Amino acid sequence: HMFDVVVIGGGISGLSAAKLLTEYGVSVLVLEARDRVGGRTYTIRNEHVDYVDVGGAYVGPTQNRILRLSKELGIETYKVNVSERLVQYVKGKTYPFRGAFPPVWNPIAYLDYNNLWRTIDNMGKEIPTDAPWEAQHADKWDKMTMKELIDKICWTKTARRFAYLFVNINVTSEPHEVSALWFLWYVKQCGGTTRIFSVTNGGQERKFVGGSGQVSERIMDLLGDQVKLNHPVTHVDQSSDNIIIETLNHEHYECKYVINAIPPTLTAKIHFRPELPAERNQLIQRLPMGAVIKCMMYYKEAFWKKKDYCGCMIIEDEDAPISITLDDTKPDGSLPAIMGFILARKADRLAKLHKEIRKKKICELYAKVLGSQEALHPVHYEEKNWCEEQYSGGCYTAYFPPGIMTQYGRVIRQPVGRIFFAGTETATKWSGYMEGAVEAGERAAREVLNGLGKVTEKDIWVQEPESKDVPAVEITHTFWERNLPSVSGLLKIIGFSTSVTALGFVLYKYKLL
Ligand SMILES: Cc1cc2nc3c(=O)[nH]c(=O)nc-3n(C[C@H](O)[C@H](O)[C@H](O)COP(=O)(O)OP(=O)(O)OC[C@H]3O[C@@H](n4cnc5c(N)ncnc54)[C@H](O)[C@@H]3O)c2cc1C
Ligand SMILES: COc1ccc2c(c1)[nH]c1c(C)nccc12
Ligand SMILES: CCCCCCCCCCP(C)(C)=O
Ligand SMILES: CCCCCCCCCCP(C)(C)=O
């Protein structure tokens, strides 16, 4: 019952924190609300699936903390399948393709699309990773929704529609719901558009053998009985020098420091004393979670592979259940599966259906999309609705509605007295991700170790050596990607050379050429 540190939450962020503190000889108790660890990562194990991640799954280049943390725990990664053709499903029609983004054949649409990604990334360049509210344009951009920005950026309908999907896919919410400032920041802090969206050399490159649930399971092993499951913290009281923590079953723990390692929306329910600053209380009640239902469809045979598809479908169609999928076949070829997400508005919609109506609907879309009736004969179906996770609030992460970032956002990871705040939402790189959970756990641990006098100020924020197993190849854009004009830019240029072609006709008739 008496510890130096209590960590509230045994997600990756909380366990990381607890694991670091333990290395330093500090006593830590982790108080985990659920009957398991790992939080928004959850590897289910039954004999239908062997194992499957129903929560966070993927890792890739530049995600150095999670790779290092997982490697040290004896967890191996494997590459996501992209040997075959990706597909785009738009307007009833399936378009196979290669590369990260679907091809845009229409020349004007192409300039639009191209300019959209470059502009997302250039606008990002201005946003400080760790102080987005300090952006030169923070106030202006934070007032916009991402729908407004997209519609301001994009002339074509294709580009707009796609960009709205891009939003859904990344922040599992609707572009009208999210600040353009926060969204530009969110893609920036994941490496940019190409890194965030890609499989190869991107955030979706890899998965863990045996599941990402294992990152948390094994740290809980190392911590032994220093991790208590079924202890949701309901009160935290730092009035006196021993902080008193109370759990839902009325147990009391005391400690010198607390690391809050749960998302904002759950932070918002803890009864703190003294009360948190009023900015902070506003902040943490105004960050909603996104909406995802992760659905895994199992088949006997990876029939998509026969048709030369990898199982990655980018599904751009309002009435389709799923938005995006990946092959989820086991690394040795066994238990073939498609992983699909139901995202944003569509998740809230679909969640009101029965499971077997959701199943049926997904199989039908897949038959349609992959053009094969074999899609209608799944051998098993696994799903997790994160909207209905009481100790998660939703997935993958919190979004910032317009206004919130410049109004209350500065204090997102500021300590309140001896309470330090971890959780992926407070990470500055790959925040929203398992990677950002580790950055944030280890940095809060270090904030506590600085307090205990065991680590210096300089040492709180430590950069991760690059993984040698999964190194980061640099994202490059072609000459044409860099320099093609936006639609609007075309018009400017064309006006300049219709004009001048005219003057070369004035000069030619005058004969002064
Ligand atoms: C469907 C899904 C897909 C995603 N895909 C990916 C992916 O492919 N790659 C990736 O990197 N990330 C992905 N993410 C996000 C990733 O899962 C999270 O960013 C990461 O797990 C968050 O870690 P955390 O430690 O910060 O928070 P959490 O994992 O939420 O940990 C919080 C912990 O606190 C507990 N808790 C809540 N309230 C209390 C309380 N009051 N007291 C005590 N404990 C409490 C919870 O039970 C939980 O165990 C996804 C998440 C989901 C749900
Ligand atoms: C471009 O194709 C995909 C496939 C899966 C994901 C994706 C893009 N972006 C994702 C994110 C941000 N999280 C989980 C899965 C995916
Ligand atoms: C002046 C018109 C602009 C020219 C650009 C058109 C590019 C289309 C072909 C590239 P893709 C392989 C389909 O992405
Ligand atoms: C003068 C206008 C015509 C320009 C030709 C268009 C070339 C597009 C190729 C696209 P990428 C090779 C992927 O960057």
From Swiss-Prot:
The modification Phosphoserine is found at residue 372. GO terms for molecular function: flavin adenine dinucleotide binding; monoamine oxidase activity; primary methylamine oxidase activity. Changing residue 312 to S: No loss of activity. It catalyses: a secondary aliphatic amine + O2 + H2O = a primary amine + an aldehyde + H2O2; (R)-adrenaline + O2 + H2O = (R)-3,4-dihydroxymandelaldehyde + methylamine + H2O2; a primary methyl amine + O2 + H2O = an aldehyde + H2O2 + NH4(+); dopamine + O2 + H2O = 3,4-dihydroxyphenylacetaldehyde + H2O2 + NH4(+). Residues 1-486 are cytoplasmic. InterPro entries: Amino_oxidase, FAD/NAD-bd_sf, Flavin_amine_oxidase, Flavin_MAO. Changing residue 387 to S: No loss of activity. Signal peptide: none annotated. It comes from the Eukaryota. Residues 509-511 are annotated as: Interaction with membrane phospholipid headgroups. It is a single-pass type IV membrane protein. Residues 508-513 are mitochondrial intermembrane. The record marks 324 as: Important for substrate specificity. Keywords: Acetylation, Catecholamine metabolism, Disease variant, FAD, Flavoprotein, Intellectual disability, Membrane, Mitochondrion, Mitochondrion outer membrane, Neurotransmitter degradation, Oxidoreductase, Phosphoprotein, Transmembrane, Transmembrane helix. One of its GO terms (biological process) is dopamine catabolic process. Changing residue 154 to S: No loss of activity. It is linked to Brunner syndrome: A form of X-linked non-dysmorphic mild intellectual disability. Male patients are affected by borderline intellectual deficit and exhibit abnormal behavior, including disturbed regulation of impulsive aggression. Obligate female carriers have normal intelligence and behavior. Monomer, homo- or heterodimer (containing two subunits of similar size). Each subunit contains a covalently bound flavin. Enzymatically active as monomer. This is Amine oxidase [flavin-containing] A. The gene is MAOA.
